[PDB]
Write a protein that binds this ligand. Structure first.
Ligand SMILES: */C=C/c1nc(Nc2ccc(CC(N)=O)cc2)nc2[nH]cnc12
Length: 238
């Protein structure tokens, strides 16, 4: 439970990750260095509540949180968590664009199913906040603004997931604009292209239903799962 117990392999993204290996067993994890040196007792309570909340969630489709470490000599809190060895989804989109190949509908279904399960757990979000493990399994972790969020309910997450899945299919968000007001206009207009014709009408139908303007028209977390399109192997397999 100390920064001296871990070795640093390299930095992933500057808080700043590092990817760490624990000398005891040799386990690969990551930590994020958040330096509170410039924070008063005000930030302490909120940050500790955030830590309490994050270290409590135990779900396969969410990046697991493990330990907390303090090195007062550095005033940098290390937050430890699992290392999704497959990277984030934004990198998958980047690789798809750079090789002129579309992602397999089965993979889009995987992401849809596992992220819907993760959202259901959170009730009981960009391609960069979504990682993959070695089994190509989807983990959630810390353009997509919803109609209501810009005139905040559970269906707003449905909308965000619909935008994510659309971007996975089409390799670009459903609403492309240069200015923010132009984006809000394209959204309130509530119109977008169909996902590539390589994808079934059913995938497009579920994704479109997520992107309805009226929140009460988007599918609940369960209506998404009740869909004949979602099979077993789209689920997280250890
Ligand atoms: C701290 C970031 C982080 N990284 C991983 N694995 C991984 C992520 C991204 C990439 C490509 C990139 N961003 O350059 C490769 C590997 N897993 C994590 N889990 C929690 N935080 C991370």
């Amino acid at each position: 439970s100390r920064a001296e117990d871990y070795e640093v392999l390299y930095t992933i993204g500057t808080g700043r990750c590092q990817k760490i290996r624990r000398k005891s067993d040799g386990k690969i994890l990551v930590w994020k260095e958040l330096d509170y040196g410039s924070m008063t007792e005000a930030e302490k309570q909120m940050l500790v509540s955030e830590v309490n909340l994050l270290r409590e969630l135990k779900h396969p489709n969410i990046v697991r949180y493990y330990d907390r470490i303090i090195d007062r000599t550095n005033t940098t809190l290390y937050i430890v968590m699992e290392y999704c060895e497959g990277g984030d989804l934004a990198s998958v989109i980047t690789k798809g664009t750079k090789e002129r190949q579309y992602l397999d509908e089965e993979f889009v279904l995987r992401v849809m199913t596992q992220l819907t399960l993760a959202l259901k757990e959170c009730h009981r979000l960009k391609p960069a906040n979504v990682f993959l493990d070695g089994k190509q399994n989807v983990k959630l972790g810390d353009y997509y603004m919803s109609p209501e969020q810009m005139n905040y309910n559970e269906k707003s997450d449905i909308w965000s997931l619909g935008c994510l899945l659309y971007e996975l299919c089409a390799l670009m968000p459903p609403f492309t604009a240069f200015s923010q007001k132009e984006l809000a206009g394209k959204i309130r207009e509530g119109k977008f292209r169909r996902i590539p014709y390589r994808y079934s009408d059913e995938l497009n139908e579920i994704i479109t239903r997520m992107l309805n303007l009226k929140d009460y028209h988007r599918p609940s977390v369960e209506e998404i799962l009740e869909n004949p399109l979602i099979l077993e192997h789209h689920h997280h397999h250890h």
